[PDB]
Chain A
Amino acid sequence: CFEPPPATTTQTGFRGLSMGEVLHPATVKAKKERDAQYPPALAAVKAEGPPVSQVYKNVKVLGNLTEAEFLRTMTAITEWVSPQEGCTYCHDENNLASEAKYPYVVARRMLEMTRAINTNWTQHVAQTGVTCYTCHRGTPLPPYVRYLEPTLPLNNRETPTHVERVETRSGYVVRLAKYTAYSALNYDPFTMFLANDKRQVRVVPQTALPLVGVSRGKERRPLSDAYATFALMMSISDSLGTNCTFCHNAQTFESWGKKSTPQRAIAWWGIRMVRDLNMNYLAPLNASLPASRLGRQGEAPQADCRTCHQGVTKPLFGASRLKDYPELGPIK
């Protein structure tokens, strides 16, 4: 029923405002241990020699690497994504230039995606950055992905119960609930807010009085939007292992300046990054994946905050391999 004390608490606002983190040490410990499994950087190799655009046949993204550097990247990718199957997860064992296995073409695109995150989305990932591991954690299917309807368990390495399965209609409300930190909010914030850029998260007026022409009848947004935004925030909070005060002074959720933390601005960039990943890199992979990887509407699995963060405010507690793998970005 309960979590025994002591609680670890931080301060994220002016004294007397009850703003900050509230953490269970055993939980933090467990997540640190899981995340500590991040394989170390591979040893540095020879700088020096022909580029693989010359040496190999079908290199389209990493062509400027030396052979040693390139094969180092292939070793790293294998550890991070398909360590149990090895190189032949993506490659034809008798022809390494062949693109015949679907993971190969997906991986090329993921190389482009990863370089784009570390190059174009530094407003979010800073100099920490991401590798294949950040999401995949050693398996071809990342453990925390989203479809265009809620799915359970959140971690797809866990066996579902009958009621958790997406086909069992009686379990829908719980699938929704377990995506919004157990709330009864009747909204899927993934498809609403993170799959694409169609909706506005903000719902609160920035004036005291109602502006004429936007405040009556069909001029107005429905109150549902406010519930849906709350659902997104419950999800974001749970996805990062945190609460509203990490980012907001609840006095005024809609205000920036002294009323929001620096982390709130990083979160904002995070939403933008996720929409780009989903719209431009992940969703289009439905044409490359086997039917067995797709959801019930033919969608490829897509990313949310949890895909990388997995219950922690910085993914992997801020572990980085950025300087170890320059070929994953930032690209000059």
Chain B
Amino acid sequence: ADYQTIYTQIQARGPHITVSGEWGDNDRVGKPFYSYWLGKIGDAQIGPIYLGASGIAAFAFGSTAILIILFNMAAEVHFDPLQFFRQFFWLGLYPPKAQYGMGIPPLHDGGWWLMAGLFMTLSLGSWWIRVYSRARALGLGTHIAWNFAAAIFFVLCIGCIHPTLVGSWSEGVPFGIWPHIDWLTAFSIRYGNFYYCPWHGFSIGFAYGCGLLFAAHGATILAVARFGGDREIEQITDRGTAVERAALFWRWTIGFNATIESVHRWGWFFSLMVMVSASVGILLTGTFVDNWYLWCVKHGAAPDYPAYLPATPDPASLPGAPK
């Protein structure tokens, strides 16, 4: 067994490294400190962290949104601290319950929700700049920013683009632990079962696919850790036995294989597509499909099953039936 694949048996300490960026070196803050126990399964060094205008703006905007949310939650329990702590997960900040269309809703019925969403959006945009610009400052490609952009885009789809496309703020995601969860079912119900949305299925194949690939790749690297396979940058620029063996493990198993560079493209793509697929589904929902199950039935795709208990006519259609 390679015990190093489980934890670091002998940890190393040395002077802390700083790689200079094109700007902002003076805005790194923190004295780094070392955790022995973290050091078993990751790098022991915590900090420093980079400040910068965009990270600060992120925190200002995001904290403002969190304050709006929390305050509305607290009002929901009449500002009783014990009940707040007890009931926390059930608490929420809700989009408008009445139909005002795309009218800015009243603060008591959706307005605070829209305002928290505004601040959240500003926070996410600010963090995106940080994620993008740090790569540029360090002479790195912007691959992480582009992947992050698709995640942000998905959040904008369920937060404001779908609402805008069907013309109602009532359709947005609530803030809150159980309440944002309850929206999943409300939305799936309204649009005729999300299992029948092909893009929901694409998103899930990719999401499950990220599971498969990170298990497979993480395991593969650990399996070739004895050959320094974790040093993937120089394995890319100068192929070593680590990644010859890795490629051959997969070739001999499934009949084909990647390179140490391209497996990361597969992973990046799969990740990206979880979010790209979701966004497309959402963008089609309500705009151009009202009931995904019935759309599948229209196109001959949906499974059907014999009656078990007797088929049951809609009593609403019976003669003389009440409304």
Contact (Cβ within 8 A) A226 B179: no
Question: What is the distance, in angstroms, from B101's C-beta to the closest C-beta of chain A?
Answer: 4
Q: Closest residue to A11 on the B side, CB-wise? A: B308
B97 surroundings in chain A (CB, below 8 A): 222, 224
Tell me whether B290 is interfacial, beta carbon within 8 Å: yes
Tell me whether B192 is interfacial, beta carbon within 8 Å: yes
B293 surroundings in chain A (CB, below 8 A): 251-252, 255
Among the stretches B198-206, B215-223, B312-320, the one at the interface with A is B312-320
**Known A-B contacts A12-B309, A205-B290; A223 and B170 likewise in contact (beta carbons under 8 Å):** yes
A-B contacts, 30 listed (Cβ < 8 Å): A14-B307, A15-B308, A123-B315, A171-B83, A173-B87, A183-B182, A184-B89, A184-B90, A184-B92, A184-B177, A184-B179, A185-B182, A197-B322, A197-B323, A207-B294, A208-B298, A209-B289, A217-B168, A218-B99, A220-B99, A220-B167, A222-B99, A223-B170, A223-B186, A226-B186, A227-B182, A249-B305, A251-B193, A258-B306, A265-B315
Contact (Cβ within 8 A) B187 A265: no
Within 8 A of A (CB), among B73-108: 76-78, 80, 83, 87, 89-92, 94-102
Give the top 10 A-B pairs by smallest Cβ distance, nearest first.
A184-B178, A217-B167, A222-B170, A170-B80, A205-B290, A14-B305, A208-B295, A169-B78, A256-B314, A224-B97
Contact (Cβ within 8 A) B312 A265: yes
Contact (Cβ within 8 A) A257 B311: yes
Contact (Cβ within 8 A) A256 B185: no
> How many CB-defined contacts (below 8 Å) exist between A and B?
176
Tell me whether B111 is interfacial, beta carbon within 8 Å: no
Question: What is the distance, in angstroms, from A262's C-beta to the closest C-beta of chain B?
Answer: 5
Mask: chain A, 264-289; 1 = CB below 8 Å from B; 0 = not: 11001100100000000000000000
Measured in the bound complex, the distance between the Cα atoms of B304 and A17 in whole Å is 11
Tell me whether B288 is interfacial, beta carbon within 8 Å: yes
Contact (Cβ within 8 A) A209 B305: no
**Known A-B contacts A184-B182, A207-B290; A216 and B166 likewise in contact (beta carbons under 8 Å):** yes
A186 surroundings in chain B (CB, below 8 A): 92, 94, 179
Which of A173, A215, A221, A254 is in CB contact (< 8 Å) with B91?
A173
Tell me whether B279 is interfacial, beta carbon within 8 Å: no
**Known A-B contacts A227-B182, A260-B312, A265-B312; A206 and B294 likewise in contact (beta carbons under 8 Å):** yes
Question: What is the distance, in angstroms, from A195's C-beta to the closest C-beta of chain B?
Answer: 16
Label chain B's interface by main secondary structure: loop
A227 surroundings in chain B (CB, below 8 A): 182-183, 186
Interface core residue of A11, A186, A249, A250 (most chain B CB under 10 Å): A186
Tell me whether B271 is interfacial, beta carbon within 8 Å: no
Tell me whether B176 is interfacial, beta carbon within 8 Å: yes
B20 surroundings in chain A (CB, below 8 A): none
Which of B87, B297, B311 is in CB contact (< 8 Å) with A258?
B311
Within 8 A of B (CB), among A143-176: 163, 169-174
> What residues make up the interface of A, taking CB atoms closer than 8 Å to B?
11-15, 17, 19, 123, 163, 169-174, 177, 183-186, 197, 203-211, 215-218, 220-224, 226-227, 229-230, 249-258, 260-262, 264-265, 268-269, 272
**Known A-B contacts A173-B76, A265-B312; A210 and B89 likewise in contact (beta carbons under 8 Å):** no
Contact (Cβ within 8 A) A209 B90: no
B308 surroundings in chain A (CB, below 8 A): 11-15, 19
Question: What is the distance, in angstroms, from A231's C-beta to the closest C-beta of chain B?
Answer: 9
Contact (Cβ within 8 A) A257 B312: yes
Question: What is the distance, in angstroms, from A276's C-beta to the closest C-beta of chain B?
Answer: 8
Contact (Cβ within 8 A) A268 B315: yes
> What residues make up the interface of B, taking CB atoms closer than 8 Å to A?
76-78, 80, 83, 87, 89-92, 94-102, 166-168, 170-171, 176-179, 181-183, 185-187, 189-190, 192-193, 195, 286-291, 293-295, 297-298, 302-316, 322-323
Contact (Cβ within 8 A) A174 B90: yes
Measured in the bound complex, the distance between the Cα atoms of B83 and A197 in whole Å is 35
**Known A-B contacts A185-B182, A253-B189; A211 and B170 likewise in contact (beta carbons under 8 Å):** no
Q: Closest residue to B82 on the A side, CB-wise? A: A170
Which of B99, B177, B286, B302 is in CB contact (< 8 Å) with A215?
B286
**Known A-B contacts A183-B178, A205-B290; A223 and B315 likewise in contact (beta carbons under 8 Å):** no
Contact (Cβ within 8 A) B305 A204: no
B311 surroundings in chain A (CB, below 8 A): 256-258
A sample of 15 more A-B contacts (CB under 8 A), given A19-B308, A186-B179, A264-B312, is A12-B309, A170-B80, A184-B92, A186-B94, A204-B192, A206-B291, A207-B294, A210-B289, A222-B96, A222-B99, A223-B168, A223-B171, A227-B182, A253-B193, A262-B310
B313 surroundings in chain A (CB, below 8 A): 256-257, 265
B310 surroundings in chain A (CB, below 8 A): 262
Contact (Cβ within 8 A) A261 B312: yes
